[PDB]
mmCIF file of C-alpha atoms (C1' of nucleotides) and ligand atoms in Angstrom:
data_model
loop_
_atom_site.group_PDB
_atom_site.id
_atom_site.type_symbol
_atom_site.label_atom_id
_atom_site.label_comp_id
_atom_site.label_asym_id
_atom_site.label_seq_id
_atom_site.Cartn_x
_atom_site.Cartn_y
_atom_site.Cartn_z
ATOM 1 C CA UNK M 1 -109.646 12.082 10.834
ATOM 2 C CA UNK M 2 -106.240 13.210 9.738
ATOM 3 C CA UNK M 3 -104.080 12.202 6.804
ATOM 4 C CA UNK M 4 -100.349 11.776 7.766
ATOM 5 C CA UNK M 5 -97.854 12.675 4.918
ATOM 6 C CA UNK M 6 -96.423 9.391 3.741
ATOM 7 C CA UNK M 7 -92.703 10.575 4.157
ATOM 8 C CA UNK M 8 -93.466 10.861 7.714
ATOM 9 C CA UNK M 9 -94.942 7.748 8.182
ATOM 10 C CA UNK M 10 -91.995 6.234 6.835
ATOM 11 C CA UNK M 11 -90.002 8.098 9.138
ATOM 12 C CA UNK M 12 -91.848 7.408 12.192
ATOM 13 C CA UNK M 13 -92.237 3.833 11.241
ATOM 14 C CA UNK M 14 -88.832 3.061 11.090
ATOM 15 C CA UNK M 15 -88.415 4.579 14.361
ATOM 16 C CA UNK M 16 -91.186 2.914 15.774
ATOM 17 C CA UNK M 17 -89.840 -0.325 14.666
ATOM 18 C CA UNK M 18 -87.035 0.700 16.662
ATOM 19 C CA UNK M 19 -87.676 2.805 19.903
ATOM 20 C CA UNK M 20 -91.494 2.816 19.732
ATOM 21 C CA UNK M 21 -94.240 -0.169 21.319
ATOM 22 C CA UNK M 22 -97.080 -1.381 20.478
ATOM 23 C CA UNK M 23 -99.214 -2.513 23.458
ATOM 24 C CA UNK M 24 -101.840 -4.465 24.655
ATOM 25 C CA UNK M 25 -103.161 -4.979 28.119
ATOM 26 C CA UNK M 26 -105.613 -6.596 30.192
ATOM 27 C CA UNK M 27 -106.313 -4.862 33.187
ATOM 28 C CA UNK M 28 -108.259 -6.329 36.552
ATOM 29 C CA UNK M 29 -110.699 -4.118 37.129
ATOM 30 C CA UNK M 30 -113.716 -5.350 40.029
ATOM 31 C CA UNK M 31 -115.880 -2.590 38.370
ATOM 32 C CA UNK M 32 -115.645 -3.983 35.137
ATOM 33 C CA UNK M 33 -117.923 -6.474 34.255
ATOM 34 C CA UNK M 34 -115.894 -8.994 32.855
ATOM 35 C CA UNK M 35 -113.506 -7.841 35.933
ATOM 36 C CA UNK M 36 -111.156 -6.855 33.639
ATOM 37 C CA UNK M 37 -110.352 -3.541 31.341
ATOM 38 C CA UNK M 38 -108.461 -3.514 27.812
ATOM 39 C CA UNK M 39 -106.109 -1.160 27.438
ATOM 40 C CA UNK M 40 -104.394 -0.096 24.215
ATOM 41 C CA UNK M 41 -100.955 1.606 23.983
ATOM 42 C CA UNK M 42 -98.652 3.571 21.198
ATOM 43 C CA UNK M 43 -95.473 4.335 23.509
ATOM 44 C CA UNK M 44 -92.459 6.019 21.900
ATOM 45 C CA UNK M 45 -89.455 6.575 24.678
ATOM 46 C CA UNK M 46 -86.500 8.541 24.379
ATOM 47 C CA UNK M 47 -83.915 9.972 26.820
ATOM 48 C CA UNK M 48 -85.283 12.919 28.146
ATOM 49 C CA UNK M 49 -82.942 14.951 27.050
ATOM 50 C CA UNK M 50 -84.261 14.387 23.983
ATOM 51 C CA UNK M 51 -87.820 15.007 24.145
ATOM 52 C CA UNK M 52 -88.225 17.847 21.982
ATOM 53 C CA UNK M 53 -88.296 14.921 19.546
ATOM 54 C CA UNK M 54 -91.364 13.380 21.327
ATOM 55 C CA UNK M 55 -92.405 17.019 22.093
ATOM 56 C CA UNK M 56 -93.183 17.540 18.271
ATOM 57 C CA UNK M 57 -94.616 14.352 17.814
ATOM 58 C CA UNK M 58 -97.631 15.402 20.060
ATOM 59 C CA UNK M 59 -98.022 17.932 17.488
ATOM 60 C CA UNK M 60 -97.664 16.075 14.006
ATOM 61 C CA UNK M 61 -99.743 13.593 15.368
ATOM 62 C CA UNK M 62 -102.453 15.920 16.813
ATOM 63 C CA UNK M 63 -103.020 13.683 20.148
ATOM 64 C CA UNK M 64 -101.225 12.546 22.788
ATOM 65 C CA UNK M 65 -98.832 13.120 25.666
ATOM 66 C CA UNK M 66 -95.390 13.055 26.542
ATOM 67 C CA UNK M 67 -95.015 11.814 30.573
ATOM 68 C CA UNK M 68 -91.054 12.261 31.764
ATOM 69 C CA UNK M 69 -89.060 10.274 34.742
ATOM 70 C CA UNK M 70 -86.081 11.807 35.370
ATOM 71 C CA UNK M 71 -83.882 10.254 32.429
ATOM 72 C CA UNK M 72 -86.578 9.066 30.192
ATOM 73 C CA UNK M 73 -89.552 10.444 28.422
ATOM 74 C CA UNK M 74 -92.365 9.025 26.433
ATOM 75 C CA UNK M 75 -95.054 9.639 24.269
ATOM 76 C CA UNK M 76 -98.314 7.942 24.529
ATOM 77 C CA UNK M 77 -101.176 7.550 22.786
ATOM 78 C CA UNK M 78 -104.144 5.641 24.124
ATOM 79 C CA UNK M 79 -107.454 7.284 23.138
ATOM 80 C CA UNK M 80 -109.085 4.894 20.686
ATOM 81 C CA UNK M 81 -110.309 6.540 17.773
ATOM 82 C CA UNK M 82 -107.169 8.799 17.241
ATOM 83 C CA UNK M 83 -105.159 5.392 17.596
ATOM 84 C CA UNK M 84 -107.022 3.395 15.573
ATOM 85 C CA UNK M 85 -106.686 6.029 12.678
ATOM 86 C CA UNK M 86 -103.039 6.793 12.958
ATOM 87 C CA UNK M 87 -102.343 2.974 13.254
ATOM 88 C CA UNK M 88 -104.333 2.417 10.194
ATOM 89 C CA UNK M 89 -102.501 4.494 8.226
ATOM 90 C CA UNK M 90 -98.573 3.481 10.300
ATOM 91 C CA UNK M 91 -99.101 -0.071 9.483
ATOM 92 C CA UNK M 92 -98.363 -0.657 5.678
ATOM 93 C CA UNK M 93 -94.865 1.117 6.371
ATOM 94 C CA UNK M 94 -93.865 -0.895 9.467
ATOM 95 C CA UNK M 95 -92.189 -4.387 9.678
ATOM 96 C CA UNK M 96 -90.994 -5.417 12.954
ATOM 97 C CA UNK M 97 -94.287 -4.268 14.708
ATOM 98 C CA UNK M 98 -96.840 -4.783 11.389
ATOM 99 C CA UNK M 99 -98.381 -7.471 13.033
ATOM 100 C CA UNK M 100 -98.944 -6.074 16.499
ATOM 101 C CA UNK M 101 -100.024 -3.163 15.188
ATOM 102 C CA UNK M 102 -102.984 -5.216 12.732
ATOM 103 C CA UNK M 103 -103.935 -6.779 15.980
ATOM 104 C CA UNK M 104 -104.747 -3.362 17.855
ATOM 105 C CA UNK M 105 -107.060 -2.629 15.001
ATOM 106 C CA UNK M 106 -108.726 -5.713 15.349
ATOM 107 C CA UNK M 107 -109.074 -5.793 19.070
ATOM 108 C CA UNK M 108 -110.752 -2.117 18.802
ATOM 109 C CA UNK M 109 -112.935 -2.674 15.394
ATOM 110 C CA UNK M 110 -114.413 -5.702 17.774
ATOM 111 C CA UNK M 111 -114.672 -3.950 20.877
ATOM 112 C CA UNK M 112 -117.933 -3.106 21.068
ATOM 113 C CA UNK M 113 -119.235 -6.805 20.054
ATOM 114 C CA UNK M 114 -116.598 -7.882 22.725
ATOM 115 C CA UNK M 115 -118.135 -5.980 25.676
ATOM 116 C CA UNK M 116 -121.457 -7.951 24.637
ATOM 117 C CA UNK M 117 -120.505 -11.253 26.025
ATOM 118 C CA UNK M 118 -118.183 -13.532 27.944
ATOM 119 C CA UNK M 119 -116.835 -15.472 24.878
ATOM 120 C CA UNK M 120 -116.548 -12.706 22.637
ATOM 121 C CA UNK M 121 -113.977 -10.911 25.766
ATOM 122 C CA UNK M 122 -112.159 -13.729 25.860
ATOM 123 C CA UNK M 123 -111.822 -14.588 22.055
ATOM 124 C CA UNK M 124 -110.299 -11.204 21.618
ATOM 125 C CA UNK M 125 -107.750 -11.696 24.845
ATOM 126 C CA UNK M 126 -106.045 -14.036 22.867
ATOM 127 C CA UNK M 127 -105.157 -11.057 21.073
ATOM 128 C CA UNK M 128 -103.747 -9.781 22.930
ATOM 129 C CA UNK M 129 -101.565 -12.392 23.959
ATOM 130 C CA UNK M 130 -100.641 -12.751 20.619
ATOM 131 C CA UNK M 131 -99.409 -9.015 20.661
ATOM 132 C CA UNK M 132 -97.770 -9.910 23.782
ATOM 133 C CA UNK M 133 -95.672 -12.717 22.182
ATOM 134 C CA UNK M 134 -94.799 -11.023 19.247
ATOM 135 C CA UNK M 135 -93.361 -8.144 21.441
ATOM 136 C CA UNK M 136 -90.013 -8.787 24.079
ATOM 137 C CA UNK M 137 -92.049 -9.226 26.507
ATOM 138 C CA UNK M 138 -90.705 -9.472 29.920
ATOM 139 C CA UNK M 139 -93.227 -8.893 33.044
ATOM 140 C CA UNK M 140 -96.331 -9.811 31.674
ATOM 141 C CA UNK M 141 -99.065 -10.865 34.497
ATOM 142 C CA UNK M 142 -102.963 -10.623 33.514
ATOM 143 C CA UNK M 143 -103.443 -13.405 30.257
ATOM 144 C CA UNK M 144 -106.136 -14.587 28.741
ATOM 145 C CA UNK M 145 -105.959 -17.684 31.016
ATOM 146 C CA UNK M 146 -106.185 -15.471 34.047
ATOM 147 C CA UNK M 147 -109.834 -14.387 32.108
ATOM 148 C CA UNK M 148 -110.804 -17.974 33.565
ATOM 149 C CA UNK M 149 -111.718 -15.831 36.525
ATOM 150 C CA UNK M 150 -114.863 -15.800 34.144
ATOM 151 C CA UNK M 151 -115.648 -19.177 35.291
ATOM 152 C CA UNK M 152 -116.150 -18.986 38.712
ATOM 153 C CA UNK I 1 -71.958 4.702 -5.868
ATOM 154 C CA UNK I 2 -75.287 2.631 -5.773
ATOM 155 C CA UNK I 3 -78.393 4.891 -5.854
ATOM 156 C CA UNK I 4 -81.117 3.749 -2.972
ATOM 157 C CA UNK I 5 -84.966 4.529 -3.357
ATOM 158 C CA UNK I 6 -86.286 7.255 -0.886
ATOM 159 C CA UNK I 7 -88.934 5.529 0.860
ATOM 160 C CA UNK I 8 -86.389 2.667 1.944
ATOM 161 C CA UNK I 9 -84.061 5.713 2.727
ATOM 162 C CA UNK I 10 -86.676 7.592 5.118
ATOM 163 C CA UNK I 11 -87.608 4.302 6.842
ATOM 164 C CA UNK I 12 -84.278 3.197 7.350
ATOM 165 C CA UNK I 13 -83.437 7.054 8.436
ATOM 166 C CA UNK I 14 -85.872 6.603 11.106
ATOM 167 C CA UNK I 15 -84.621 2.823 12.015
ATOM 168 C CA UNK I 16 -81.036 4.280 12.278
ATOM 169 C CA UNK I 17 -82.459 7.243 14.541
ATOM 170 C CA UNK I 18 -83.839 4.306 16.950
ATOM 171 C CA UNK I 19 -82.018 1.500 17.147
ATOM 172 C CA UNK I 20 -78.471 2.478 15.362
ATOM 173 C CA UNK I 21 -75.368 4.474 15.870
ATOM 174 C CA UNK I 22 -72.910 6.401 14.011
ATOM 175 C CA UNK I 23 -68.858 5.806 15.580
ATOM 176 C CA UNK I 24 -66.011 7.859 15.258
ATOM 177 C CA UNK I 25 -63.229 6.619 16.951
ATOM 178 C CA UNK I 26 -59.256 7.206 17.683
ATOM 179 C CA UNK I 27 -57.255 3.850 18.337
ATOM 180 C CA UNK I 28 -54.143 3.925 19.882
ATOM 181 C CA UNK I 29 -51.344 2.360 17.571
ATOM 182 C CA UNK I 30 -47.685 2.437 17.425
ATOM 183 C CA UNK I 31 -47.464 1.279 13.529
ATOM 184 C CA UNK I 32 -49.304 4.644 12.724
ATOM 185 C CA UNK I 33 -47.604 7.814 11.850
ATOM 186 C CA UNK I 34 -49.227 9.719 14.740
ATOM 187 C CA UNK I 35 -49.786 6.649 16.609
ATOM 188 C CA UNK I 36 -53.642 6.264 16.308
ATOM 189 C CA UNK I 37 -55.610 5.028 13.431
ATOM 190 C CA UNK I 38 -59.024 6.492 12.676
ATOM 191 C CA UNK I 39 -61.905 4.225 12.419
ATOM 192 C CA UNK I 40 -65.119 5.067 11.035
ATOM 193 C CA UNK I 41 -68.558 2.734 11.663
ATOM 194 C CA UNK I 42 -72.396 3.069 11.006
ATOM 195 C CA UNK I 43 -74.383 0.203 12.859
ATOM 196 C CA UNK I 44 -77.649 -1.069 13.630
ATOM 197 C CA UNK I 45 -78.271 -3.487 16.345
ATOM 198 C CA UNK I 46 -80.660 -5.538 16.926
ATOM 199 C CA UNK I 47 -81.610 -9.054 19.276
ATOM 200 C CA UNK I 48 -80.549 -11.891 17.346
ATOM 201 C CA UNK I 49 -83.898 -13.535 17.144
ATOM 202 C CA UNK I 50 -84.146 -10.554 14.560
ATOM 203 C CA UNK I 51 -81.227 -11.247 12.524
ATOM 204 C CA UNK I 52 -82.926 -11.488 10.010
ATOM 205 C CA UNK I 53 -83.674 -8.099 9.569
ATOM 206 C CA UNK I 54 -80.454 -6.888 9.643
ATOM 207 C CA UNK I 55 -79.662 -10.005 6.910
ATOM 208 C CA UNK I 56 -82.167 -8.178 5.012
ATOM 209 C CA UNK I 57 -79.920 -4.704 5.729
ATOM 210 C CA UNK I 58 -76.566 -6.330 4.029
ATOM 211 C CA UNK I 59 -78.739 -7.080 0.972
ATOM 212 C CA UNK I 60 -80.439 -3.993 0.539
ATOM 213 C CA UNK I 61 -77.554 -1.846 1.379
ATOM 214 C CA UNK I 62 -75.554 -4.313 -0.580
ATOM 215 C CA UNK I 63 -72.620 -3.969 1.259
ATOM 216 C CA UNK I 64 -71.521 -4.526 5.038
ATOM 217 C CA UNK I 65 -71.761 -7.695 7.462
ATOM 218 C CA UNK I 66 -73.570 -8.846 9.958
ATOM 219 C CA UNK I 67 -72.085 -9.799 13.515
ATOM 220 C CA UNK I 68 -73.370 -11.980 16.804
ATOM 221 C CA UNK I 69 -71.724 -11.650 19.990
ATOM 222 C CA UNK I 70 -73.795 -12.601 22.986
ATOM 223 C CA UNK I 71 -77.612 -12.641 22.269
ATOM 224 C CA UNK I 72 -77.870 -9.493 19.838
ATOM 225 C CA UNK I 73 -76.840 -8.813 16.207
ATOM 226 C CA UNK I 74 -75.041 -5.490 14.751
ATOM 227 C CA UNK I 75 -74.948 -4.913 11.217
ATOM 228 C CA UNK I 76 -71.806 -2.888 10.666
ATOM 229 C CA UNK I 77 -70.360 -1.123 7.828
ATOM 230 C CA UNK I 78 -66.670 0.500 8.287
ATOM 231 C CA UNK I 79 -65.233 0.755 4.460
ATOM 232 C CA UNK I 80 -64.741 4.366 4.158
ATOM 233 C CA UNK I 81 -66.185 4.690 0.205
ATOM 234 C CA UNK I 82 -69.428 2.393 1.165
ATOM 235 C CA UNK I 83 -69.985 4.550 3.911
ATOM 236 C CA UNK I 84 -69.377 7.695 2.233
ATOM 237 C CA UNK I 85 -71.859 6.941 -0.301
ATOM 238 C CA UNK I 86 -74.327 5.675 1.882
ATOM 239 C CA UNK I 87 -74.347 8.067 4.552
ATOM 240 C CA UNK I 88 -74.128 10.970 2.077
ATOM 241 C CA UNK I 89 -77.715 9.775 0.707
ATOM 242 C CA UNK I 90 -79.117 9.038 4.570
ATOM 243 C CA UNK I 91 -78.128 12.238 5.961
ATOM 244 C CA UNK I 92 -81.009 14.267 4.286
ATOM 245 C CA UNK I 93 -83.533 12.142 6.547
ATOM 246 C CA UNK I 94 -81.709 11.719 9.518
ATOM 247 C CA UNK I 95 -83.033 13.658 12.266
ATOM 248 C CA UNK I 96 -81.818 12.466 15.543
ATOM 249 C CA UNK I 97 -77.780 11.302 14.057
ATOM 250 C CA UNK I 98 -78.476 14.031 10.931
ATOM 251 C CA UNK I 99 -74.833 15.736 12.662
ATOM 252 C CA UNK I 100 -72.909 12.359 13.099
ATOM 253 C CA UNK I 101 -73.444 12.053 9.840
ATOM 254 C CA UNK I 102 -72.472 14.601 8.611
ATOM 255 C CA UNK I 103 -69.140 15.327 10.829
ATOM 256 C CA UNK I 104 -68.092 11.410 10.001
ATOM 257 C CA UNK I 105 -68.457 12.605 6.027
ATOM 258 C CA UNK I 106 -66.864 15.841 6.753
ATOM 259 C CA UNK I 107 -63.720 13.607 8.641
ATOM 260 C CA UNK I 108 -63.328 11.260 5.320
ATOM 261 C CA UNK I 109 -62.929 14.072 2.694
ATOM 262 C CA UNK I 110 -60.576 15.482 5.325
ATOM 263 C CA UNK I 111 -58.729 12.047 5.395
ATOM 264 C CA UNK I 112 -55.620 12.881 3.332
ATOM 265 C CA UNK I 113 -55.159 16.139 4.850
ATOM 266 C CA UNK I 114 -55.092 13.908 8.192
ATOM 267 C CA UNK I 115 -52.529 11.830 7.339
ATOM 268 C CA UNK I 116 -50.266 14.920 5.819
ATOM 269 C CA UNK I 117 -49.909 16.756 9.213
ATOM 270 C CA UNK I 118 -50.335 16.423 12.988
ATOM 271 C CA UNK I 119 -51.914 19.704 13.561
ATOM 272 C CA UNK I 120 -54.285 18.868 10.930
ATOM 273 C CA UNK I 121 -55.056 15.035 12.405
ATOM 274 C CA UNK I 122 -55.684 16.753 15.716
ATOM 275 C CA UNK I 123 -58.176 18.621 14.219
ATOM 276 C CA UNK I 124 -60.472 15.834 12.917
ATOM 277 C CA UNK I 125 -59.930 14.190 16.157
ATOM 278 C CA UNK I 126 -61.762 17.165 17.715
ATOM 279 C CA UNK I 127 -64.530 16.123 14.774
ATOM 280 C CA UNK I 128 -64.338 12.750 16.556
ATOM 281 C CA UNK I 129 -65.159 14.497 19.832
ATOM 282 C CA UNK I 130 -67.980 15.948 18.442
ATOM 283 C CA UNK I 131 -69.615 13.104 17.422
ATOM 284 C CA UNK I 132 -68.998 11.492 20.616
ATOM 285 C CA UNK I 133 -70.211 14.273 22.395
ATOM 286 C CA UNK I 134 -73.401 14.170 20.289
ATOM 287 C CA UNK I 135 -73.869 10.694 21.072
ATOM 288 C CA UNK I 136 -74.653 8.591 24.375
ATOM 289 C CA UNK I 137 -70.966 8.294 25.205
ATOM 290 C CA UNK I 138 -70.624 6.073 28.297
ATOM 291 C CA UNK I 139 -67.156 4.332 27.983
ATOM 292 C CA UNK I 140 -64.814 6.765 25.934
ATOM 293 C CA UNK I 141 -60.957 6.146 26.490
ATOM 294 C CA UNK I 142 -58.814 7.842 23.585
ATOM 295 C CA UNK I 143 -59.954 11.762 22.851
ATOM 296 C CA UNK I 144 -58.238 14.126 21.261
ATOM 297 C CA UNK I 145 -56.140 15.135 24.175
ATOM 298 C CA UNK I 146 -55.015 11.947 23.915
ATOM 299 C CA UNK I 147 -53.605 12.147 20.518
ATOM 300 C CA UNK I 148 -51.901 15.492 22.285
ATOM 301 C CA UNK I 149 -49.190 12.833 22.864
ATOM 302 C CA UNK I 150 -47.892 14.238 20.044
ATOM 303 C CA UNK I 151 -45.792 15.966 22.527
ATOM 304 C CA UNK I 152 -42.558 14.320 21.690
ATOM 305 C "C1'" DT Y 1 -48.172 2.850 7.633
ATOM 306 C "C1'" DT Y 2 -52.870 2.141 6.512
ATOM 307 C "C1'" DG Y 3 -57.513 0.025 6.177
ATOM 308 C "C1'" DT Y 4 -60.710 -3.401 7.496
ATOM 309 C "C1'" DT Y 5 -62.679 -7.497 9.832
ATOM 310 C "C1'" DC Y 6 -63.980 -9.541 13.841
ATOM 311 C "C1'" DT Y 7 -64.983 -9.978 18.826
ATOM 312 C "C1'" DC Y 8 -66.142 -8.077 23.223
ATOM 313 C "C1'" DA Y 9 -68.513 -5.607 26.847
ATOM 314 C "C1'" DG Y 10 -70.154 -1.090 30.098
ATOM 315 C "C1'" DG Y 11 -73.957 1.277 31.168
ATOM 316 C "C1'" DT Y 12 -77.826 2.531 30.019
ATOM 317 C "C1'" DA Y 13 -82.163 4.100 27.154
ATOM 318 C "C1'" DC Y 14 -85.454 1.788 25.924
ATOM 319 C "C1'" DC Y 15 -89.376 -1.444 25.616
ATOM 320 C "C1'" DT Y 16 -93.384 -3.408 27.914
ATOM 321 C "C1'" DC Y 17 -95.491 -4.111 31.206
ATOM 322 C "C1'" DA Y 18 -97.781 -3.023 36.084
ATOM 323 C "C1'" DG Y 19 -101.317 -0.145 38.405
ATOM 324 C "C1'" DC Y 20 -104.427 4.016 40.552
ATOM 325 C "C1'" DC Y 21 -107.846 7.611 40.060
ATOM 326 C "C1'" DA Y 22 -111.017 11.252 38.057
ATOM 327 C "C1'" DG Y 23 -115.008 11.966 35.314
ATOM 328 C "C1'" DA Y 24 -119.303 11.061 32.624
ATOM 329 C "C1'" DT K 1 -119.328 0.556 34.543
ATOM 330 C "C1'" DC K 2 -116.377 2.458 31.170
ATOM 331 C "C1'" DT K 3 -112.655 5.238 29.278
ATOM 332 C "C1'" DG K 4 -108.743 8.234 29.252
ATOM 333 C "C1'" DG K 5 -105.113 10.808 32.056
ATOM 334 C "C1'" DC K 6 -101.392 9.750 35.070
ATOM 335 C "C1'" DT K 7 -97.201 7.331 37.634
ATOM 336 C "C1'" DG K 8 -93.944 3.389 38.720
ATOM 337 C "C1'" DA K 9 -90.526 0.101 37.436
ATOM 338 C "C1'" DG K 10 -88.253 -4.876 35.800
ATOM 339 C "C1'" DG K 11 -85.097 -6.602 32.576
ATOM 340 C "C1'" DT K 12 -83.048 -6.191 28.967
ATOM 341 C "C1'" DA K 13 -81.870 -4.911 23.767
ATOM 342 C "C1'" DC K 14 -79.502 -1.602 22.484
ATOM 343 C "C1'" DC K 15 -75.915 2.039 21.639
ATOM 344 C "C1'" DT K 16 -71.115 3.181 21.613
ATOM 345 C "C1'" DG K 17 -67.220 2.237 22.563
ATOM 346 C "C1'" DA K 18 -62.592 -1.007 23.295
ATOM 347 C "C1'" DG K 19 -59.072 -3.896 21.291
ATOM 348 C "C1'" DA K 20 -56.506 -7.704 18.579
ATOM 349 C "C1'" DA K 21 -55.547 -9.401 14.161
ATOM 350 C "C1'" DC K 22 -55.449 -10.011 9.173
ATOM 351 C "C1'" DA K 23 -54.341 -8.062 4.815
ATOM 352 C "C1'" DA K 24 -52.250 -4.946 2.267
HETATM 353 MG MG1 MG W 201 -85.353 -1.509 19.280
HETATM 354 MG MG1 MG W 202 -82.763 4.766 20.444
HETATM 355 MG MG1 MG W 203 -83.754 1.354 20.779
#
DNA sequence: TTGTTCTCAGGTACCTCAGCCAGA
DNA sequence: TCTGGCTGAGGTACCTGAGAACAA
């Protein structure tokens, strides 16, 4: 587990707070089975003329990738462990995304009792829903609700 | 000449790198004495559902207003001192707008040369250009080789 | 002749999803 | 079945100007 220097965190959590997202996803999966997958997300997009800036970023973070389309670049991070310890120690500096951010940790610290039973799944979809409110979200599909497939 | 704490400094540093711009600009004007005015602004934006944020940016900065136009909110600051002092303490953690900042500070100390002679206004409106240049400029009207209309 | 406040809007550069597939 | 690497794209929420007017 690495320890972040504290003057980058503040850095990188004001520019989170700005250009950076904090995501959580429910994804329909038929080999899943709950028929769905979770997925977590740290995104940071910039132009791509710019992504020296995410460039480096795979490197004081340690993990991660930066994926580029044409005018636009961004990193991601979406391996669990590595995001659950770099979020743990981002979230006391950030403010616009604090809360989403507390949420990922909780959805992963409960995955494993979450993949042991239907109610347990869908208790921790609301989660994510509540991530998904909190951020401007626009073309959301798969809910919590659309976990009802459960009951069938 | 108020004196702001670091960590507020590097997260706002990174918040300013996301989400907020630093504006040189010529504007045409007939009262002036080479018929453009120079105008100087640092601004964060932000969707008005997050006003308060930027509320909270007037208050800690101390200085500055907020605006609403539409569905988003800019905090803006344009007084030349304010900005001098404020920019000349953010520049250090800038990154991403560390040059804009710098050039804009570089343009005010160079202010009453400026005004003294044409060749020398010409020359921080090439300063202008830079910054522009260094920014995302989409919708640029009045350059430099405008202000050549000192050809008269 | 200057500085500053206030409003407006073009053109993206972000945000925040969607989804497929390889591998263990 | 599960997770992590990878690509695609809708709908703005930003960026970065423009300009008119008030106040000296
Ligand atoms: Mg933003
Ligand atoms: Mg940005
Ligand atoms: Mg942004």
């Amino acid at each position: 587990n690495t320890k972040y220097n504290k003057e980058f965190l503040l850095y990188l959590a004001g520019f989170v707070d700005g250009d950076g997202s904090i995501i959580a996803q429910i994804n329909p999966n038929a080999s899943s089975k709950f028929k769905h997958r979770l997925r977590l997300t740290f995104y940071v997009t910039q132009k791509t003329q710019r992504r020296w800036f995410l460039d480096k970023l795979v490197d004081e973070i340690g993990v991660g990738y930066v994926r580029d389309s044409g005018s636009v670049s961004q990193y991601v991070l979406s391996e669990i462990a590595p995001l659950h310890n770099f979020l743990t120690q981002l979230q006391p500096f950030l403010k616009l995304k604090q809360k989403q951010a507390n949420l990922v940790l909780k959805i992963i610290e409960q995955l494993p009792s979450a993949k042991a039973s239907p109610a347990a799944f869908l208790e921790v979809c609301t989660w994510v829903d509540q991530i998904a409110a909190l951020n401007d979200s626009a073309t959301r599909k798969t809910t919590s609700e659309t976990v009802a497939a459960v009951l069938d």
